Amino acid sequence: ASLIYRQLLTNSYTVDLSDEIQEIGSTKSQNVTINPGPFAQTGYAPVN
Amino acid sequence: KLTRTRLDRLYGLPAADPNNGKEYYEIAGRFSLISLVPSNDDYQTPIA
């Protein structure tokens, strides 16, 4: 009856195939890099 | 000087012939223009 544990561990490479099957159906999206930092304070010029 | 008129040796370009047939009034000069330009730096692009 331990064969169940042994085989569950052995035949685990198919988990990757299942993951690929899920991934292909997953909706994909991309993110762009965020401009970081203490942005310089620039204000209006002196006008009249 | 305008002939057959009062003005004699008046000064100032008239509305008659300021071009004098000159090709063009070529003025060469530099210009420094400080303006608030738009830019995202090298950001806001895909992470790859």
Side-chain angles (χ1 to χ4, degrees):
Chain A
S2 56
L3 187 67
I4 185 57
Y5 297 157
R6 287 192 252 101
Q7 292 186 348
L8 279 174
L9 190 58
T10 293
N11 304 323
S12 296
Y13 62 90
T14 62
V15 176
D16 304 334
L17 304 191
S18 282
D19 291 3
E20 301 313 326
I21 293 171
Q22 298 298 334
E23 180 272 4
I24 67 175
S26 68
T27 73
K28 303 177 179 59
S29 55
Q30 196 75 338
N31 286 27
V32 300
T33 53
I34 301 303
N35 189 320
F39 308 94
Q41 308 296 92
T42 62
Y44 294 115
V47 301
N48 267 12
Chain B
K1 297 172 179 181
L2 277 167
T3 54
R4 288 192 169 188
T5 68
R6 304 178 181 181
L7 281 188
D8 306 333
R9 300 177 180 176
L10 168 141
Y11 328 83
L13 290 174
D17 245 18
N19 281 350
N20 294 24
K22 289 178 176 177
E23 292 180 348
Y24 298 101
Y25 288 84
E26 294 184 0
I27 310 175
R30 284 176 177 177
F31 290 84
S32 75
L33 321 178
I34 299 165
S35 64
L36 186 84
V37 308
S39 69
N40 281 348
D41 291 351
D42 301 356
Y43 285 103
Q44 302 284 327
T45 59
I47 193 172

Coordinates of all heavy atoms in Angstrom, one line a residue:
Chain A
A1 N 0.8 -1.2 0.0 CA 0.0 0.0 0.0 C 0.9 1.3 0.0 O 0.4 2.3 -0.4 CB -0.9 0.0 1.2
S2 N 2.1 1.1 0.4 CA 3.1 2.2 0.3 C 3.4 2.6 -1.1 O 4.0 3.7 -1.3 CB 4.4 1.9 1.0 OG 4.9 0.7 0.5
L3 N 3.0 1.8 -2.1 CA 3.2 2.1 -3.5 C 2.5 3.4 -3.8 O 3.0 4.1 -4.7 CB 2.6 1.0 -4.3 CG 3.0 1.1 -5.8 CD1 4.4 0.9 -6.1 CD2 2.1 0.1 -6.6
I4 N 1.5 3.8 -3.1 CA 0.8 5.1 -3.5 C 1.8 6.2 -3.2 O 1.9 7.1 -4.0 CB -0.5 5.2 -2.7 CG1 -1.3 6.5 -3.1 CG2 -0.3 5.3 -1.2 CD1 -1.5 6.6 -4.6
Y5 N 2.4 6.2 -2.0 CA 3.3 7.3 -1.7 C 4.5 7.3 -2.6 O 4.9 8.3 -3.2 CB 3.8 7.1 -0.2 CG 2.8 7.3 0.8 CD1 3.0 6.7 2.1 CD2 1.6 8.0 0.6 CE1 2.0 6.8 3.1 CE2 0.6 8.1 1.6 CZ 0.9 7.5 2.8 OH -0.1 7.6 3.8
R6 N 5.0 6.1 -2.9 CA 6.2 6.0 -3.7 C 5.9 6.5 -5.1 O 6.7 7.2 -5.7 CB 6.8 4.5 -3.8 CG 7.4 4.1 -2.5 CD 8.2 2.8 -2.6 NE 7.5 1.7 -1.9 CZ 6.7 0.8 -2.5 NH1 6.6 0.8 -3.8 NH2 6.2 -0.1 -1.7
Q7 N 4.8 6.1 -5.7 CA 4.5 6.5 -7.0 C 4.0 8.0 -7.1 O 4.4 8.7 -8.1 CB 3.3 5.7 -7.6 CG 3.8 4.2 -7.9 CD 2.7 3.4 -8.6 OE1 1.6 3.8 -8.7 NE2 3.1 2.2 -9.0
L8 N 3.4 8.5 -6.1 CA 3.0 9.9 -6.0 C 4.3 10.8 -6.0 O 4.4 11.8 -6.7 CB 2.2 10.2 -4.8 CG 0.7 9.9 -4.9 CD1 0.0 10.2 -3.6 CD2 0.0 10.8 -6.0
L9 N 5.3 10.3 -5.3 CA 6.6 11.1 -5.4 C 7.3 10.9 -6.7 O 7.8 11.8 -7.3 CB 7.5 10.6 -4.2 CG 8.7 11.5 -4.0 CD1 8.3 12.9 -3.8 CD2 9.6 11.0 -2.9
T10 N 7.3 9.6 -7.2 CA 8.1 9.4 -8.4 C 7.5 10.1 -9.6 O 8.3 10.8 -10.4 CB 8.1 7.9 -8.7 OG1 8.8 7.2 -7.7 CG2 8.7 7.6 -10.0
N11 N 6.2 10.0 -9.9 CA 5.6 10.6 -11.1 C 5.2 12.0 -10.9 O 4.1 12.4 -11.3 CB 4.4 9.7 -11.5 CG 4.8 8.3 -11.7 OD1 5.8 7.9 -12.2 ND2 3.8 7.4 -11.3
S12 N 6.1 12.8 -10.3 CA 5.8 14.2 -10.1 C 6.3 15.1 -11.2 O 5.9 16.3 -11.1 CB 6.5 14.6 -8.8 OG 6.0 13.9 -7.7
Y13 N 7.0 14.7 -12.2 CA 7.4 15.5 -13.3 C 6.3 15.9 -14.1 O 6.4 16.9 -14.9 CB 8.5 14.8 -14.1 CG 7.9 13.5 -14.8 CD1 7.3 13.6 -16.0 CD2 8.0 12.3 -14.1 CE1 6.8 12.4 -16.6 CE2 7.5 11.2 -14.7 CZ 6.9 11.2 -15.9 OH 6.4 10.1 -16.5
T14 N 5.1 15.2 -14.0 CA 3.9 15.6 -14.8 C 3.3 16.9 -14.2 O 2.4 17.5 -14.9 CB 2.9 14.5 -14.8 OG1 2.5 14.2 -13.5 CG2 3.6 13.2 -15.4
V15 N 3.7 17.3 -13.0 CA 3.1 18.5 -12.4 C 3.6 19.7 -13.3 O 2.8 20.6 -13.4 CB 3.6 18.6 -10.9 CG1 3.2 20.0 -10.4 CG2 3.1 17.5 -10.1
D16 N 4.8 19.6 -13.8 CA 5.2 20.7 -14.7 C 4.3 20.8 -15.9 O 4.0 21.9 -16.4 CB 6.7 20.5 -15.1 CG 7.6 20.3 -13.9 OD1 7.3 20.9 -12.8 OD2 8.7 19.7 -14.0
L17 N 4.0 19.6 -16.5 CA 3.1 19.7 -17.7 C 1.7 20.2 -17.3 O 1.1 21.0 -18.1 CB 2.9 18.3 -18.3 CG 4.3 17.6 -18.6 CD1 4.0 16.3 -19.4 CD2 5.2 18.5 -19.4
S18 N 1.2 19.9 -16.2 CA -0.1 20.4 -15.7 C 0.1 22.0 -15.5 O -0.9 22.7 -15.9 CB -0.6 19.8 -14.4 OG -1.1 18.5 -14.7
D19 N 1.2 22.4 -15.0 CA 1.4 23.8 -14.8 C 1.5 24.5 -16.2 O 0.9 25.6 -16.3 CB 2.7 24.1 -14.1 CG 2.6 23.6 -12.6 OD1 1.5 23.1 -12.2 OD2 3.6 23.8 -11.9
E20 N 2.1 23.9 -17.2 CA 2.1 24.5 -18.5 C 0.7 24.6 -19.1 O 0.3 25.6 -19.7 CB 3.0 23.8 -19.4 CG 4.5 23.7 -19.0 CD 5.0 25.0 -18.5 OE1 4.6 26.1 -19.1 OE2 5.8 25.0 -17.6
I21 N -0.1 23.6 -18.9 CA -1.5 23.6 -19.3 C -2.3 24.7 -18.7 O -3.1 25.4 -19.4 CB -2.2 22.2 -19.1 CG1 -1.5 21.1 -19.9 CG2 -3.7 22.3 -19.4 CD1 -1.9 19.7 -19.5
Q22 N -2.1 24.9 -17.4 CA -2.7 26.1 -16.8 C -2.2 27.4 -17.3 O -3.0 28.3 -17.5 CB -2.6 26.0 -15.2 CG -3.2 24.7 -14.6 CD -4.7 24.7 -14.8 OE1 -5.3 25.7 -15.0 NE2 -5.2 23.5 -14.8
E23 N -0.9 27.5 -17.5 CA -0.3 28.7 -17.9 C -0.8 29.2 -19.2 O -1.0 30.4 -19.4 CB 1.2 28.6 -17.9 CG 2.0 29.8 -18.3 CD 2.2 29.9 -19.8 OE1 1.7 29.1 -20.5 OE2 2.9 30.9 -20.2
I24 N -0.9 28.3 -20.2 CA -1.3 28.6 -21.5 C -2.7 29.3 -21.5 O -3.0 30.2 -22.2 CB -1.2 27.5 -22.5 CG1 -2.3 26.4 -22.2 CG2 0.2 26.9 -22.5 CD1 -2.3 25.3 -23.2
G25 N -3.6 28.7 -20.6 CA -4.9 29.3 -20.5 C -4.9 30.6 -19.6 O -5.9 31.3 -19.7
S26 N -3.9 30.8 -18.8 CA -3.9 32.0 -18.0 C -3.8 33.2 -18.9 O -3.1 33.2 -19.9 CB -2.7 32.0 -17.0 OG -1.5 32.1 -17.7
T27 N -4.4 34.3 -18.4 CA -4.3 35.6 -19.1 C -3.0 36.3 -18.7 O -2.7 36.4 -17.5 CB -5.5 36.5 -18.7 OG1 -5.4 37.0 -17.4 CG2 -6.8 35.7 -18.9
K28 N -2.3 36.8 -19.6 CA -1.0 37.4 -19.4 C -1.0 38.9 -19.5 O -1.8 39.5 -20.2 CB 0.0 36.9 -20.4 CG 0.1 35.4 -20.4 CD 1.1 34.9 -21.5 CE 1.2 33.3 -21.5 NZ -0.2 32.7 -21.7
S29 N -0.2 39.6 -18.7 CA -0.1 41.0 -18.6 C 1.4 41.4 -18.3 O 2.1 40.6 -17.7 CB -1.0 41.6 -17.6 OG -0.8 41.0 -16.3
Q30 N 1.7 42.6 -18.6 CA 3.1 43.1 -18.5 C 3.0 44.4 -17.7 O 2.1 45.2 -17.8 CB 3.7 43.3 -19.8 CG 5.2 43.5 -19.8 CD 6.0 42.2 -19.5 OE1 5.4 41.2 -19.0 NE2 7.2 42.1 -19.9
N31 N 4.1 44.7 -17.0 CA 4.3 46.0 -16.2 C 5.5 46.7 -16.7 O 6.5 46.1 -17.0 CB 4.3 45.7 -14.7 CG 3.0 45.3 -14.1 OD1 2.1 44.8 -14.8 ND2 2.8 45.6 -12.9
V32 N 5.4 48.0 -16.7 CA 6.6 48.9 -17.1 C 7.3 49.4 -15.8 O 6.7 49.5 -14.8 CB 6.1 50.0 -18.0 CG1 5.5 49.5 -19.2 CG2 5.2 50.9 -17.2
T33 N 8.6 49.6 -16.0 CA 9.4 50.1 -14.8 C 8.9 51.4 -14.3 O 8.4 52.3 -15.1 CB 10.8 50.2 -15.2 OG1 10.9 51.0 -16.4 CG2 11.4 48.8 -15.5
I34 N 8.9 51.6 -13.0 CA 8.4 52.8 -12.3 C 9.6 53.7 -12.1 O 10.6 53.4 -11.5 CB 7.8 52.4 -11.0 CG1 6.6 51.4 -11.2 CG2 7.3 53.7 -10.3 CD1 5.5 51.9 -12.2
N35 N 9.4 55.0 -12.6 CA 10.4 56.0 -12.5 C 10.5 56.4 -11.0 O 9.6 57.0 -10.5 CB 10.1 57.2 -13.3 CG 11.2 58.2 -13.4 OD1 11.9 58.5 -12.4 ND2 11.5 58.8 -14.5
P36 N 11.6 56.0 -10.3 CA 11.7 56.3 -8.9 C 12.4 57.6 -8.6 O 12.9 58.3 -9.4 CB 12.5 55.1 -8.3 CG 13.3 54.7 -9.5 CD 12.8 55.4 -10.7
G37 N 12.5 57.9 -7.3 CA 13.4 58.9 -6.8 C 12.8 60.1 -6.2 O 11.6 60.4 -6.4
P38 N 13.6 60.9 -5.5 CA 13.1 62.2 -5.0 C 13.1 63.3 -6.1 O 14.1 64.0 -6.4 CB 14.1 62.5 -3.9 CG 15.4 61.9 -4.3 CD 15.0 60.6 -5.0
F39 N 12.0 63.3 -6.8 CA 11.9 64.2 -8.0 C 12.2 65.6 -7.7 O 11.8 66.1 -6.6 CB 10.5 64.1 -8.6 CG 10.0 62.7 -8.8 CD1 9.3 62.0 -7.9 CD2 10.4 62.0 -10.0 CE1 8.9 60.7 -8.1 CE2 9.9 60.7 -10.2 CZ 9.2 60.1 -9.3
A40 N 13.0 66.3 -8.5 CA 13.4 67.6 -8.3 C 12.2 68.5 -8.3 O 11.3 68.4 -9.1 CB 14.4 68.1 -9.4
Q41 N 12.2 69.5 -7.4 CA 11.1 70.5 -7.3 C 11.4 71.6 -8.3 O 12.3 72.5 -8.0 CB 11.0 71.0 -5.9 CG 10.9 69.9 -4.8 CD 9.7 69.1 -4.9 OE1 9.7 68.1 -5.6 NE2 8.6 69.5 -4.3
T42 N 10.6 71.7 -9.3 CA 10.7 72.8 -10.3 C 9.3 73.4 -10.4 O 8.3 72.8 -10.6 CB 11.1 72.2 -11.7 OG1 10.1 71.3 -12.2 CG2 12.4 71.5 -11.6
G43 N 9.3 74.7 -10.2 CA 8.1 75.5 -10.2 C 8.0 76.5 -11.3 O 8.8 76.5 -12.2
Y44 N 7.0 77.4 -11.3 CA 6.8 78.4 -12.3 C 8.0 79.4 -12.2 O 8.5 79.6 -11.2 CB 5.5 79.1 -12.1 CG 4.3 78.3 -12.4 CD1 3.4 78.0 -11.3 CD2 4.0 77.7 -13.6 CE1 2.3 77.2 -11.5 CE2 2.9 77.0 -13.8 CZ 2.0 76.7 -12.8 OH 0.9 75.9 -13.0
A45 N 8.3 80.0 -13.4 CA 9.3 81.0 -13.5 C 8.7 82.3 -12.9 O 7.5 82.5 -12.7 CB 9.7 81.2 -14.9
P46 N 9.6 83.2 -12.5 CA 9.1 84.5 -12.0 C 8.6 85.4 -13.1 O 9.4 85.8 -14.0 CB 10.4 85.1 -11.3 CG 11.6 84.4 -12.0 CD 11.1 83.3 -12.8
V47 N 7.3 85.8 -13.1 CA 6.7 86.5 -14.1 C 6.0 87.7 -13.6 O 6.0 87.9 -12.3 CB 5.6 85.6 -14.8 CG1 6.2 84.4 -15.4 CG2 4.5 85.2 -13.9
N48 N 5.6 88.6 -14.5 CA 5.0 89.9 -14.1 C 3.7 90.1 -14.9 O 3.8 90.5 -16.1 CB 6.0 91.0 -14.3 CG 6.8 91.4 -13.0 OD1 6.8 90.6 -12.1 ND2 7.5 92.5 -13.1
Chain B
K1 N 15.4 112.2 -48.5 CA 14.9 113.3 -49.2 C 13.8 112.9 -50.1 O 13.9 111.9 -50.8 CB 16.0 114.0 -50.1 CG 17.1 114.6 -49.3 CD 18.2 115.1 -50.2 CE 19.4 115.7 -49.4 NZ 20.4 116.2 -50.3
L2 N 12.6 113.6 -50.1 CA 11.5 113.4 -51.0 C 11.5 114.5 -52.0 O 11.4 115.7 -51.6 CB 10.2 113.3 -50.3 CG 9.8 111.9 -49.7 CD1 8.7 112.0 -48.7 CD2 9.5 110.9 -50.8
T3 N 11.6 114.2 -53.3 CA 11.6 115.3 -54.3 C 10.2 115.9 -54.5 O 9.2 115.2 -54.4 CB 12.1 114.7 -55.6 OG1 11.4 113.6 -56.0 CG2 13.6 114.3 -55.5
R4 N 10.2 117.2 -54.8 CA 9.0 117.9 -55.0 C 8.1 117.9 -53.7 O 6.8 117.9 -53.8 CB 8.2 117.4 -56.2 CG 8.8 117.8 -57.5 CD 7.8 117.5 -58.6 NE 8.2 118.0 -59.9 CZ 7.5 118.1 -61.0 NH1 6.2 117.5 -61.0 NH2 8.0 118.6 -62.1
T5 N 8.7 117.8 -52.5 CA 7.9 117.8 -51.3 C 8.8 118.6 -50.2 O 9.9 119.0 -50.5 CB 7.6 116.4 -50.8 OG1 8.8 115.7 -50.4 CG2 6.9 115.6 -51.9
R6 N 8.2 118.8 -49.1 CA 8.8 119.6 -48.0 C 10.0 118.9 -47.4 O 11.0 119.5 -47.2 CB 7.8 119.9 -46.9 CG 6.5 120.6 -47.4 CD 5.5 120.8 -46.3 NE 4.3 121.4 -46.7 CZ 3.3 121.7 -45.9 NH1 3.3 121.5 -44.6 NH2 2.2 122.3 -46.4
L7 N 9.9 117.6 -47.1 CA 10.9 116.9 -46.4 C 12.3 117.0 -47.1 O 12.4 116.7 -48.3 CB 10.6 115.4 -46.2 CG 9.6 115.1 -45.0 CD1 9.5 113.6 -44.9 CD2 9.9 115.8 -43.7
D8 N 13.3 117.4 -46.3 CA 14.7 117.4 -46.8 C 15.6 116.8 -45.8 O 15.6 117.3 -44.6 CB 15.1 118.9 -47.1 CG 14.2 119.6 -48.1 OD1 13.5 118.9 -48.9 OD2 14.1 120.8 -48.0
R9 N 16.2 115.7 -46.1 CA 17.1 115.0 -45.2 C 16.4 114.5 -44.0 O 17.0 114.5 -42.9 CB 18.3 116.0 -44.8 CG 19.1 116.4 -46.0 CD 20.2 117.4 -45.6 NE 21.0 117.9 -46.7 CZ 21.9 118.8 -46.7 NH1 22.3 119.4 -45.5 NH2 22.6 119.1 -47.8
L10 N 15.2 114.1 -44.1 CA 14.5 113.4 -43.0 C 15.2 112.0 -42.8 O 15.8 111.4 -43.7 CB 13.0 113.2 -43.3 CG 12.2 112.3 -42.4 CD1 10.8 112.8 -42.1 CD2 12.1 110.9 -43.0
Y11 N 15.0 111.5 -41.6 CA 15.6 110.3 -41.2 C 14.5 109.2 -40.9 O 13.5 109.6 -40.3 CB 16.5 110.4 -39.9 CG 17.2 111.8 -39.9 CD1 16.5 112.9 -39.4 CD2 18.5 112.0 -40.3 CE1 17.2 114.1 -39.3 CE2 19.1 113.2 -40.3 CZ 18.5 114.3 -39.7 OH 19.1 115.5 -39.7
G12 N 14.8 108.0 -41.3 CA 13.8 106.9 -41.0 C 13.4 106.2 -42.2 O 12.9 106.8 -43.2
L13 N 13.4 104.9 -42.2 CA 13.0 104.0 -43.3 C 11.6 104.3 -43.7 O 10.7 104.3 -42.8 CB 13.2 102.6 -43.1 CG 14.7 102.0 -43.0 CD1 14.7 100.6 -42.5 CD2 15.4 102.2 -44.3
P14 N 11.2 104.6 -44.9 CA 9.8 104.9 -45.3 C 9.0 103.6 -45.6 O 9.6 102.5 -45.5 CB 10.0 105.8 -46.5 CG 11.3 105.3 -47.1 CD 12.0 104.4 -46.2
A15 N 7.8 103.8 -45.9 CA 7.0 102.7 -46.5 C 7.0 102.6 -48.0 O 6.1 102.1 -48.6 CB 5.5 102.9 -46.0
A16 N 8.1 103.0 -48.6 CA 8.3 103.0 -50.0 C 9.3 101.9 -50.5 O 9.0 101.1 -51.4 CB 8.7 104.4 -50.5
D17 N 10.5 101.9 -49.9 CA 11.5 101.0 -50.3 C 12.6 100.8 -49.2 O 13.6 101.3 -49.2 CB 12.3 101.5 -51.6 CG 12.0 100.6 -52.8 OD1 11.1 99.8 -52.7 OD2 12.8 100.6 -53.7
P18 N 12.2 100.0 -48.2 CA 13.2 99.6 -47.1 C 14.1 98.4 -47.5 O 15.2 98.3 -47.0 CB 12.3 99.3 -45.9 CG 11.1 98.8 -46.5 CD 10.9 99.5 -47.8
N19 N 13.5 97.6 -48.4 CA 14.3 96.4 -48.9 C 15.5 96.9 -49.7 O 16.6 96.3 -49.5 CB 13.4 95.5 -49.8 CG 12.5 94.6 -48.9 OD1 12.7 94.5 -47.7 ND2 11.6 93.9 -49.6
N20 N 15.4 97.9 -50.5 CA 16.4 98.4 -51.4 C 16.9 97.3 -52.4 O 18.0 97.3 -52.8 CB 17.6 98.9 -50.6 CG 17.3 100.2 -49.8 OD1 16.2 100.4 -49.5 ND2 18.3 100.9 -49.5
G21 N 16.0 96.4 -52.7 CA 16.3 95.2 -53.5 C 17.3 94.2 -52.9 O 17.7 93.3 -53.6
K22 N 17.5 94.4 -51.6 CA 18.4 93.4 -50.9 C 17.8 92.0 -51.0 O 16.6 91.8 -50.9 CB 18.6 93.8 -49.5 CG 19.5 95.0 -49.2 CD 19.6 95.4 -47.8 CE 20.5 96.6 -47.5 NZ 20.5 96.9 -46.1
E23 N 18.7 91.0 -51.2 CA 18.2 89.7 -51.3 C 17.4 89.3 -50.1 O 16.2 89.1 -50.2 CB 19.4 88.7 -51.5 CG 20.2 88.8 -52.8 CD 21.3 87.9 -52.9 OE1 21.7 87.3 -51.9 OE2 21.9 87.7 -54.0
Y24 N 18.1 89.3 -48.9 CA 17.4 89.1 -47.6 C 18.3 89.7 -46.5 O 19.5 89.7 -46.6 CB 17.0 87.7 -47.4 CG 16.1 87.1 -48.4 CD1 16.6 86.2 -49.4 CD2 14.7 87.3 -48.4 CE1 15.7 85.7 -50.4 CE2 13.9 86.8 -49.3 CZ 14.4 86.0 -50.3 OH 13.5 85.5 -51.3
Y25 N 17.6 90.1 -45.4 CA 18.3 90.7 -44.3 C 18.8 89.5 -43.4 O 18.2 89.1 -42.5 CB 17.4 91.6 -43.5 CG 17.1 92.9 -44.2 CD1 16.1 93.0 -45.1 CD2 17.8 94.0 -43.9 CE1 15.8 94.2 -45.8 CE2 17.5 95.2 -44.5 CZ 16.5 95.3 -45.4 OH 16.3 96.5 -46.1
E26 N 20.0 89.0 -43.8 CA 20.6 87.9 -43.1 C 21.2 88.3 -41.8 O 22.2 89.0 -41.7 CB 21.7 87.2 -44.0 CG 21.2 86.6 -45.3 CD 22.3 85.9 -46.1 OE1 23.4 85.9 -45.6 OE2 22.0 85.4 -47.2
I27 N 20.5 87.8 -40.7 CA 21.0 88.0 -39.3 C 21.2 86.7 -38.7 O 20.3 85.8 -38.6 CB 19.9 88.8 -38.5 CG1 19.5 90.0 -39.2 CG2 20.5 89.1 -37.1 CD1 18.3 90.8 -38.5
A28 N 22.5 86.4 -38.4 CA 22.9 85.1 -37.8 C 23.0 85.3 -36.3 O 23.8 86.2 -35.8 CB 24.2 84.6 -38.4
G29 N 22.3 84.5 -35.5 CA 22.5 84.6 -34.0 C 22.1 83.4 -33.3 O 21.3 82.6 -33.8
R30 N 22.6 83.2 -32.1 CA 22.3 82.1 -31.3 C 21.0 82.3 -30.4 O 20.7 83.5 -30.2 CB 23.4 81.7 -30.4 CG 24.6 81.0 -31.1 CD 25.8 80.7 -30.2 NE 26.8 80.0 -31.0 CZ 28.0 79.6 -30.5 NH1 28.3 80.0 -29.2 NH2 28.8 79.0 -31.2
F31 N 20.4 81.2 -30.0 CA 19.1 81.3 -29.3 C 19.1 80.2 -28.2 O 19.2 79.0 -28.6 CB 17.9 81.2 -30.1 CG 17.7 82.4 -31.0 CD1 18.3 82.5 -32.2 CD2 16.8 83.4 -30.6 CE1 18.1 83.6 -33.0 CE2 16.6 84.5 -31.4 CZ 17.3 84.6 -32.6
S32 N 19.1 80.6 -26.9 CA 18.9 79.7 -25.8 C 17.5 79.7 -25.3 O 17.0 80.8 -24.9 CB 19.9 80.0 -24.7 OG 19.5 81.1 -24.0
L33 N 16.8 78.6 -25.4 CA 15.4 78.5 -25.0 C 15.2 77.5 -23.9 O 15.3 76.3 -24.2 CB 14.6 78.2 -26.3 CG 15.0 78.8 -27.6 CD1 14.1 78.4 -28.7 CD2 14.9 80.3 -27.5
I34 N 15.0 77.9 -22.7 CA 14.7 77.1 -21.6 C 13.2 76.9 -21.6 O 12.5 77.8 -21.3 CB 15.2 77.7 -20.3 CG1 16.7 77.9 -20.3 CG2 14.8 76.8 -19.1 CD1 17.3 78.8 -19.2
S35 N 12.8 75.6 -21.8 CA 11.4 75.3 -21.8 C 11.2 73.9 -21.0 O 12.1 73.1 -20.9 CB 10.9 75.1 -23.2 OG 11.5 74.0 -23.9
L36 N 10.0 73.8 -20.5 CA 9.6 72.6 -19.7 C 9.2 71.5 -20.8 O 8.1 71.4 -21.2 CB 8.5 72.8 -18.8 CG 8.1 71.7 -17.8 CD1 9.1 71.7 -16.6 CD2 6.7 71.8 -17.4
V37 N 10.2 70.7 -21.1 CA 10.0 69.6 -22.1 C 9.4 68.4 -21.5 O 9.6 68.2 -20.3 CB 11.2 69.3 -22.9 CG1 11.9 70.5 -23.4 CG2 12.2 68.5 -22.0
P38 N 8.6 67.6 -22.2 CA 8.1 66.3 -21.6 C 9.0 65.1 -21.9 O 9.5 64.9 -23.0 CB 6.7 66.1 -22.3 CG 6.8 66.9 -23.6 CD 8.1 67.7 -23.5
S39 N 9.2 64.3 -20.8 CA 10.0 63.1 -21.0 C 9.8 62.2 -19.8 O 9.6 62.6 -18.7 CB 11.5 63.4 -21.1 OG 12.0 63.9 -19.9
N40 N 9.8 60.9 -20.1 CA 9.7 59.9 -19.0 C 11.1 59.3 -18.6 O 11.1 58.3 -17.9 CB 8.8 58.7 -19.5 CG 7.4 59.1 -19.4 OD1 7.0 60.1 -18.8 ND2 6.5 58.2 -20.0
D41 N 12.2 59.9 -19.1 CA 13.5 59.3 -18.9 C 13.5 57.9 -19.5 O 12.6 57.6 -20.3 CB 13.9 59.2 -17.4 CG 14.1 60.6 -16.8 OD1 14.2 61.6 -17.5 OD2 14.3 60.6 -15.6
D42 N 14.5 57.1 -19.2 CA 14.5 55.7 -19.7 C 13.6 54.8 -18.9 O 14.0 53.7 -18.5 CB 15.9 55.2 -19.8 CG 16.8 56.1 -20.7 OD1 16.2 57.0 -21.3 OD2 18.0 55.8 -20.8
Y43 N 12.4 55.2 -18.6 CA 11.5 54.5 -17.8 C 10.1 54.3 -18.5 O 10.0 54.6 -19.7 CB 11.2 55.2 -16.4 CG 12.4 55.1 -15.4 CD1 13.2 56.1 -15.2 CD2 12.6 53.9 -14.7 CE1 14.3 56.0 -14.3 CE2 13.6 53.8 -13.8 CZ 14.4 54.9 -13.6 OH 15.5 54.8 -12.7
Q44 N 9.1 53.8 -17.8 CA 7.8 53.6 -18.4 C 7.8 52.7 -19.6 O 6.9 52.8 -20.5 CB 7.2 55.0 -18.7 CG 7.1 56.0 -17.5 CD 5.9 55.6 -16.6 OE1 4.9 55.1 -17.1 NE2 6.1 55.9 -15.3
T45 N 8.8 51.9 -19.7 CA 9.0 50.9 -20.8 C 8.8 49.5 -20.2 O 8.9 49.3 -19.0 CB 10.3 51.0 -21.5 OG1 11.4 50.8 -20.5 CG2 10.5 52.4 -22.1
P46 N 8.6 48.5 -21.0 CA 8.4 47.1 -20.5 C 9.7 46.7 -19.8 O 10.8 47.1 -20.1 CB 8.2 46.3 -21.8 CG 7.7 47.2 -22.8 CD 8.3 48.6 -22.5
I47 N 9.5 45.9 -18.7 CA 10.6 45.5 -17.9 C 11.7 44.7 -18.6 O 12.8 44.5 -18.1 CB 10.1 44.7 -16.6 CG1 11.2 44.6 -15.6 CG2 9.6 43.4 -17.1 CD1 10.7 44.0 -14.3
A48 N 11.3 44.2 -19.8 CA 12.2 43.4 -20.7 C 12.3 44.1 -22.0 O 12.1 43.5 -23.1 CB 11.8 42.0 -20.8

